[PDB]
Short mmCIF file of C-alpha atoms and ligand atoms in Angstrom, two decimals:
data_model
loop_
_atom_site.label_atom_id
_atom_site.label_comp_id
_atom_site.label_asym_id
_atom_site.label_seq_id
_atom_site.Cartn_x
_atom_site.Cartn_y
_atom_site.Cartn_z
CA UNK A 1 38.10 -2.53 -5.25
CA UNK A 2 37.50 1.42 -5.07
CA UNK A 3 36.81 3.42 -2.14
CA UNK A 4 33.61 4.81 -2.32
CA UNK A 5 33.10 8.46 -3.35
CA UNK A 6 31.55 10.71 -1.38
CA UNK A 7 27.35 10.60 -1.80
CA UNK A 8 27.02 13.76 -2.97
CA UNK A 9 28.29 13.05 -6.52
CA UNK A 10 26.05 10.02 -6.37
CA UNK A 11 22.87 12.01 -6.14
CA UNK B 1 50.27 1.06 -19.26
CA UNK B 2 52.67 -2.55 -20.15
CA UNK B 3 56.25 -1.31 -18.97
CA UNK B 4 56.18 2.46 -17.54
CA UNK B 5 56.73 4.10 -14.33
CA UNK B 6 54.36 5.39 -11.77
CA UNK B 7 54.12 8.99 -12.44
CA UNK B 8 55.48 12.09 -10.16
CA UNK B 9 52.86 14.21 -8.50
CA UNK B 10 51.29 16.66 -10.48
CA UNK B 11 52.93 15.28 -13.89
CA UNK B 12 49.85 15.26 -15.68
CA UNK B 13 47.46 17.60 -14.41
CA UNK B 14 45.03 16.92 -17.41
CA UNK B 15 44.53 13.64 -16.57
CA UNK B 16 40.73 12.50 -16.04
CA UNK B 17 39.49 9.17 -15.13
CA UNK B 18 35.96 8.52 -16.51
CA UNK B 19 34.12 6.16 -13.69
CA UNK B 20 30.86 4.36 -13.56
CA UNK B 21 28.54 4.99 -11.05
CA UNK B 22 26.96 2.20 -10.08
CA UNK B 23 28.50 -0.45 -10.12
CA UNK B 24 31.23 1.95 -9.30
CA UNK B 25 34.40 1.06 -11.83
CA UNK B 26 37.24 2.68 -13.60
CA UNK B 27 35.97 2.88 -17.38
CA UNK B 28 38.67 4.78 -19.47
CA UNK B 29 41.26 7.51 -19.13
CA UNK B 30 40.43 11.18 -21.04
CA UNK B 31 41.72 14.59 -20.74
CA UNK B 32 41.17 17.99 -19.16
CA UNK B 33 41.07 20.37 -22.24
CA UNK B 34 39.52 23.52 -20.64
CA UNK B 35 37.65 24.56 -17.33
CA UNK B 36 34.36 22.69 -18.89
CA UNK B 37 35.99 19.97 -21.87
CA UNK B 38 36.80 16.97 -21.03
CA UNK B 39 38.72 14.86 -24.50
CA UNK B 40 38.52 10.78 -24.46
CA UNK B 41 37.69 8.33 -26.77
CA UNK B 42 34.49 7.80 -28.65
CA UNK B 43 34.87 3.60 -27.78
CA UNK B 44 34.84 4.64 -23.87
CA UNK B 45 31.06 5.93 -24.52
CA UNK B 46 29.58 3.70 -27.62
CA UNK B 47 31.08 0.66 -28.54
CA UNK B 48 27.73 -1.75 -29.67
CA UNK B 49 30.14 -5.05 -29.77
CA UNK B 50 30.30 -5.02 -26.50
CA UNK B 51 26.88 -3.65 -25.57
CA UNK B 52 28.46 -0.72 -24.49
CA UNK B 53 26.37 3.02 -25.18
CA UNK B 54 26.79 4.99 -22.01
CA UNK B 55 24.40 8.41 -21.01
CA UNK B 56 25.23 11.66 -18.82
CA UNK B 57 23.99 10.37 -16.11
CA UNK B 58 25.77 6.99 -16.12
CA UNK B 59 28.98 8.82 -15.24
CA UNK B 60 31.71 10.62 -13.60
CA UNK B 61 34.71 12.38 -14.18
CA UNK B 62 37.53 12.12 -11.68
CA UNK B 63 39.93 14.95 -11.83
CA UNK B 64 43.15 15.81 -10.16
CA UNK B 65 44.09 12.39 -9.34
CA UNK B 66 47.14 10.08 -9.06
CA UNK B 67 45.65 6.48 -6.96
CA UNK B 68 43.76 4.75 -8.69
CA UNK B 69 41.14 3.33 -6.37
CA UNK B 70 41.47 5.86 -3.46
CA UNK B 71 39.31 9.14 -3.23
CA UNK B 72 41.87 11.49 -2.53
CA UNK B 73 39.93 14.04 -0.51
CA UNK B 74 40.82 17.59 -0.73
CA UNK B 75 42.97 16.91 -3.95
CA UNK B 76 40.83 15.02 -6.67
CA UNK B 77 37.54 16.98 -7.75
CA UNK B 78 34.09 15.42 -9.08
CA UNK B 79 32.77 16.66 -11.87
CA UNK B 80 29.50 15.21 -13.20
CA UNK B 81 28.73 15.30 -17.02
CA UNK B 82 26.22 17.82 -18.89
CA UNK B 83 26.51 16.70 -22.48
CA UNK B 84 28.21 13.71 -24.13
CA UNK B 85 29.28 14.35 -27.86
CA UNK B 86 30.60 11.78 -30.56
CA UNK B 87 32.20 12.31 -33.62
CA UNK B 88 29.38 12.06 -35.92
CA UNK B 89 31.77 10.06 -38.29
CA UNK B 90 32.93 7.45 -35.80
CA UNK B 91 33.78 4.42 -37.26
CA UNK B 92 32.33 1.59 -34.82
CA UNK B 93 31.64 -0.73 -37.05
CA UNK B 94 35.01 -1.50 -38.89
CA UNK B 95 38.22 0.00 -37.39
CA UNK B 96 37.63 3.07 -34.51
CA UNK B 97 38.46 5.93 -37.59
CA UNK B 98 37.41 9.14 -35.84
CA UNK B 99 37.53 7.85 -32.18
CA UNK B 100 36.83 10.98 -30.51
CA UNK B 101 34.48 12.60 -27.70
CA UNK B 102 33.86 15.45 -25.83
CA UNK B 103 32.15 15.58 -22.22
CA UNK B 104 31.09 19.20 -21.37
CA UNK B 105 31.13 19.62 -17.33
CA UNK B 106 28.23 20.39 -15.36
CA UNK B 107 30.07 23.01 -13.84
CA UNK B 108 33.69 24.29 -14.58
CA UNK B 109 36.55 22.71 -12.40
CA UNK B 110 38.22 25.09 -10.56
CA UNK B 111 42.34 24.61 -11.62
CA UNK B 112 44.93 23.88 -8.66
CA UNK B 113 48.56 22.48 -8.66
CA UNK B 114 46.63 18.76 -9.62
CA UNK B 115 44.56 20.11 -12.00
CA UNK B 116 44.98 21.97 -14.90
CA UNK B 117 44.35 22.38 -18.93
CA UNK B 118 46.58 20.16 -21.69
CA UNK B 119 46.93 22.21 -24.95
CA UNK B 120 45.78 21.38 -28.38
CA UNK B 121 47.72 21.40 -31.08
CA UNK B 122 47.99 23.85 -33.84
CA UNK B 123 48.55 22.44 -37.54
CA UNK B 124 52.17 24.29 -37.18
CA UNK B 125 53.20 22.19 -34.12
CA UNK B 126 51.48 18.85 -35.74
CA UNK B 127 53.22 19.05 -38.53
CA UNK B 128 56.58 19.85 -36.64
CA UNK B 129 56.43 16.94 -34.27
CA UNK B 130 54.51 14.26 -35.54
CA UNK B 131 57.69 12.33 -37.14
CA UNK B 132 58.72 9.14 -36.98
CA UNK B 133 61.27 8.39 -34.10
CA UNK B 134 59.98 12.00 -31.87
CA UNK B 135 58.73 10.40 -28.46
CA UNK B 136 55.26 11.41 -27.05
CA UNK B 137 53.82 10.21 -23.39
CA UNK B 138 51.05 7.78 -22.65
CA UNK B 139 49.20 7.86 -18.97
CA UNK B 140 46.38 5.85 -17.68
CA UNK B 141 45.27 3.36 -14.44
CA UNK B 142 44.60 0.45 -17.24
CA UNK B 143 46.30 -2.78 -16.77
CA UNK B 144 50.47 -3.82 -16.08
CA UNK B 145 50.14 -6.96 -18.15
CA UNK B 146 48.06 -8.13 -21.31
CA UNK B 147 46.85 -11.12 -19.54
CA UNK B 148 47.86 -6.63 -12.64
CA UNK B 149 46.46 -3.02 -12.02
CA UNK B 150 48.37 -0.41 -10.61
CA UNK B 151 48.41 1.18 -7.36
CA UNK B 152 48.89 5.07 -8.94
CA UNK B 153 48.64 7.06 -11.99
CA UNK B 154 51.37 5.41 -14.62
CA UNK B 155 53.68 7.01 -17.34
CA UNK B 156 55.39 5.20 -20.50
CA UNK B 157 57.07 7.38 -23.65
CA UNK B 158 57.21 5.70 -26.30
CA UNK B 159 58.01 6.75 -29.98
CA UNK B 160 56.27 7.80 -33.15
CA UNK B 161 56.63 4.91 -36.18
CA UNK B 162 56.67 5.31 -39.81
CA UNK B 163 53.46 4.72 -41.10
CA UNK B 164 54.47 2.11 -43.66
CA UNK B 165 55.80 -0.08 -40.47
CA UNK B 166 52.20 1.06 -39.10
CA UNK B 167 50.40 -0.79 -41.74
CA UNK B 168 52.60 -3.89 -42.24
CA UNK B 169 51.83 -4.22 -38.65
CA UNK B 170 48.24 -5.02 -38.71
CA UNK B 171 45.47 -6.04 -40.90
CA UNK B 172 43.18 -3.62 -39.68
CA UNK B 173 42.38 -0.62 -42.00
CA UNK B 174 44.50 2.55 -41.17
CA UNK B 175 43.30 5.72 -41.77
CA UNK B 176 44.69 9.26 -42.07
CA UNK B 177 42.79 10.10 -38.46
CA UNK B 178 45.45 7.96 -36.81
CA UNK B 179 48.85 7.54 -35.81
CA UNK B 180 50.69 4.37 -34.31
CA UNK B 181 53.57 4.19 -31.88
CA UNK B 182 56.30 1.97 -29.64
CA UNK B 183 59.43 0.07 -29.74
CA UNK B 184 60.38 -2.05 -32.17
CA UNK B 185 61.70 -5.31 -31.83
CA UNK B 186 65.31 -4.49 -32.53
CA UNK B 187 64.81 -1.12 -30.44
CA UNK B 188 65.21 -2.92 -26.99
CA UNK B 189 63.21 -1.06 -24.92
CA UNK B 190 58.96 -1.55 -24.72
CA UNK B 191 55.44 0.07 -23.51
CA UNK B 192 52.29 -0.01 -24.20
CA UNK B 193 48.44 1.59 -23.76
CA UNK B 194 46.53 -1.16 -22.11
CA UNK B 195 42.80 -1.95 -21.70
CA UNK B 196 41.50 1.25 -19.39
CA UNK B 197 43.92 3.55 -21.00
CA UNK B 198 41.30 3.74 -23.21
CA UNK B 199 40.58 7.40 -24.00
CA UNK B 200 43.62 9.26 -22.31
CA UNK B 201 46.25 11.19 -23.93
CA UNK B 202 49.28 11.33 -25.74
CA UNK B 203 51.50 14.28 -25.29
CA UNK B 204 54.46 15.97 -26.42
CA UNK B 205 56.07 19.03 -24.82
CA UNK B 206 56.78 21.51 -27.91
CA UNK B 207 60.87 22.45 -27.55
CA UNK B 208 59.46 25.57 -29.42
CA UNK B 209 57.27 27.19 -26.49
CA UNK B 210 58.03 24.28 -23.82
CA UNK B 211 53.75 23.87 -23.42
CA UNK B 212 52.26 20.07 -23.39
CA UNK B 213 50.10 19.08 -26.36
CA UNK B 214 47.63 16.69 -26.96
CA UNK B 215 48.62 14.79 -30.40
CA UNK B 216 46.84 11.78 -29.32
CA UNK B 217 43.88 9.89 -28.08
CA UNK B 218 44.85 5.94 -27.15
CA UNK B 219 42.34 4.45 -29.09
CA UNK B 220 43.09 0.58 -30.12
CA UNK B 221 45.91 -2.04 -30.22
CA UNK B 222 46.05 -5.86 -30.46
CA UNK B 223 47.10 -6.95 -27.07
CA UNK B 224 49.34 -5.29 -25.38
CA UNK B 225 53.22 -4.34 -25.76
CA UNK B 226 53.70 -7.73 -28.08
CA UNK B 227 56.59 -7.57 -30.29
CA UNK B 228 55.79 -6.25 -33.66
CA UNK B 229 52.55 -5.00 -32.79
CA UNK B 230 51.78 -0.91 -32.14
CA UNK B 231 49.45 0.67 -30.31
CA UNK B 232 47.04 3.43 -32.55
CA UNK B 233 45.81 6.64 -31.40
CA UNK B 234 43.27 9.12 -32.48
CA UNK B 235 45.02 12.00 -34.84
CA UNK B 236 43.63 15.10 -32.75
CA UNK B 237 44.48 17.61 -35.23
CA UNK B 238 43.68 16.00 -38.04
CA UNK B 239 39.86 16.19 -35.77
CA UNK B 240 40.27 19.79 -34.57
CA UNK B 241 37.89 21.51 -36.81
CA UNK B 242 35.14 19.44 -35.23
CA UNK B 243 36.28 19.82 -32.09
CA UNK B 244 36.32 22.90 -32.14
CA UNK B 245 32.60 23.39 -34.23
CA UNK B 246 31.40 21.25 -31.03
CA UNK B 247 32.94 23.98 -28.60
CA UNK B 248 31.61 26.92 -30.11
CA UNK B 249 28.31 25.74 -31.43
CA UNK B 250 27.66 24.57 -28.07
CA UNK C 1 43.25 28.20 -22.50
CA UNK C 2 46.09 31.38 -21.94
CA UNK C 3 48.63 29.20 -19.75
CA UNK C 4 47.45 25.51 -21.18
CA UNK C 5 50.10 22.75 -21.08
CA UNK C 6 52.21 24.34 -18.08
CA UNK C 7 51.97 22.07 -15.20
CA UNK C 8 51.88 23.84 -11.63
CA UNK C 9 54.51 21.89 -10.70
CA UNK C 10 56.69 22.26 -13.36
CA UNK C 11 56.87 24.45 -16.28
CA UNK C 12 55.21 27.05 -13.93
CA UNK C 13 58.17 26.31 -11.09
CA UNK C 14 60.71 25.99 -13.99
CA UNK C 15 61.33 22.40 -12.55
CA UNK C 16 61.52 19.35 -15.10
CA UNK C 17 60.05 16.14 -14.57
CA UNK C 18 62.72 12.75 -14.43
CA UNK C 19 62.26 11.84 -17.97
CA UNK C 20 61.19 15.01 -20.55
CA UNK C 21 64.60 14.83 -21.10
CA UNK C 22 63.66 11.62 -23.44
CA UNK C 23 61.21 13.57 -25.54
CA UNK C 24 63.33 16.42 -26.47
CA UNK C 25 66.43 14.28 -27.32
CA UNK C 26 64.02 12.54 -29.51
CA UNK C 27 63.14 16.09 -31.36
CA UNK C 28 65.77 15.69 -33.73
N1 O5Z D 301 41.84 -5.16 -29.91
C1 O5Z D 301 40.82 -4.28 -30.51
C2 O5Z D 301 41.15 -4.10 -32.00
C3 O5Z D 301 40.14 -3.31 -32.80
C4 O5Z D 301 40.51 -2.14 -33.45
C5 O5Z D 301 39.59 -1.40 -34.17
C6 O5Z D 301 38.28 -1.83 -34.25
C7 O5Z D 301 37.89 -2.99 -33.61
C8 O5Z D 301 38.82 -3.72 -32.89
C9 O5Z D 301 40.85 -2.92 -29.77
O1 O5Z D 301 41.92 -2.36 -29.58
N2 O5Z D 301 39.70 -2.39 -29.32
C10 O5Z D 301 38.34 -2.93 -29.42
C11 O5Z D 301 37.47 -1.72 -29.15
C12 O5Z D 301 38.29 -0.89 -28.17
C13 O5Z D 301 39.75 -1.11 -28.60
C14 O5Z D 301 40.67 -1.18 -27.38
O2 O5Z D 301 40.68 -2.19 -26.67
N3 O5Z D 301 41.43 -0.11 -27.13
C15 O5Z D 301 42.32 -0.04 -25.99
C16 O5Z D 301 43.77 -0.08 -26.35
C17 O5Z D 301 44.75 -0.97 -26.15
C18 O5Z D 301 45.95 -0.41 -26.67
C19 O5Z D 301 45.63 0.82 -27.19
BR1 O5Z D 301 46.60 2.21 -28.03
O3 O5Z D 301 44.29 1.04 -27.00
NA1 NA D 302 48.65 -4.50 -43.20
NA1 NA D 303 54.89 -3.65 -29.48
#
């Protein structure tokens, strides 16, 4: 339902 | 938010949206305080009813935004959490008394015409506008409808009630750490916090100094926007000696 | 913080948003 976020702020 | 308005660009600058990481989900609304503070609701971290007792690194804050599913590149900013911090007196158990938290910031968020600091109040300015009848603002991506999700930010104001019409409202316990608000029956008009406003703020723009405060924290309701019923929210002043013991201890 | 609860595109452009108007006709 989201667009994902950048990987970055996943890490 | 049951019965507002999407919002105008940049009309709540200190509006955060706490999100999951994986899987990757709105969880509650909260507040931009300072270049490091984030405000929201203690029930958006710990909440044992519903299994719910969330870390640092289960999260995200989401700043600068108005969508509420897109990533809005070069105008929202990511922020991920150092330190989570409940009120140590947070009432989980019974009725949400004290339903407060503060997120400190990895690293501070750099302020733009999306993004910038909500004030807190003073006891001067509490005690001037929190009166029955004076209007504050509610904001928040939770749900249109009790029983469906917007496309942007929304905005409802709704009013300040006696608390005598408070606590005929409800059989819950009400405490001195809260405050209720909306329409009456007779009033007309409606709006409502809704699940996922969880944890943002109520504001009021002081007619003294023309700044935004936070008086509020949207904290619990039953349902949404039924007759008779009023949504509560956290009293942040009545909480401000912790807050700030939290901010300056740490 | 020194200039807390002034929006950038508001208070700060001495522009109002469509309905402040509500809260301070409520500060009675
Ligand atoms: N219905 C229960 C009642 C309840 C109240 C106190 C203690 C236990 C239950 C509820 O409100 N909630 C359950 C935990 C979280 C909270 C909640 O959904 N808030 C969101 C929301 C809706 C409107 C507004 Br304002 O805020
Ligand atoms: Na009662
Ligand atoms: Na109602």
């Amino acid at each position: 339902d989201f667009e994902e976020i950048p990987e970055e702020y996943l890490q | 938010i049951v019965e507002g308005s999407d919002a105008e660009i940049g009309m709540s600058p200190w509006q955060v949206m706490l999100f999951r990481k994986s899987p990757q989900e709105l969880l509650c609304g909260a507040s931009l305080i300072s270049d490091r503070w984030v405000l929201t609701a203690a029930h958006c971290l710990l909440y044992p009813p519903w299994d719910k007792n969330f870390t640092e690194n289960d999260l995200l804050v989401r700043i600068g935004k108005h969508s509420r599913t897109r990533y809005e590149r070069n105008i929202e900013k990511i922020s991920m959490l150092e330190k989570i911090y409940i009120h140590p007196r947070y009432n989980w158990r019974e009725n949400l008394d004290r339903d407060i938290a503060l997120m400190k910031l990895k690293k501070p968020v750099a302020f733009s015409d999306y993004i910038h600091p909500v004030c807190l109040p003073d006891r001067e300015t509490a005690a001037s506008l929190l009166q029955a009848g004076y209007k504050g603002r509610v904001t928040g991506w939770g749900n249109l409808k009790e029983t469906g999700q917007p496309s942007v930010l929304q905005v409802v104001n709704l009013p300040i009630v006696e608390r005598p019409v408070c606590k005929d409202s409800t059989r819950i316990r009400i405490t001195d750490n809260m405050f209720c608000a909306g329409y009456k029956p007779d009033e007309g008009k409606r709006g409502d916090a809704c699940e996922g406003d969880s944890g943002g703020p109520f504001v009021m723009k002081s007619p003294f100094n023309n700044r935004w405060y936070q008086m509020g924290i949207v904290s619990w309701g039953e349902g949404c926007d039924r007759d008779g019923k009023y949504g509560f929210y956290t009293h942040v002043f009545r909480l401000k000696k912790w807050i700030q013991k939290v901010i300056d201890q740490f | 913080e020194a200039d807390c609860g002034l929006r950038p595109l508001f208070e700060k452009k001495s522009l109002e948003d469509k309905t402040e108007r509500e809260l301070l006709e409520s500060y009675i």
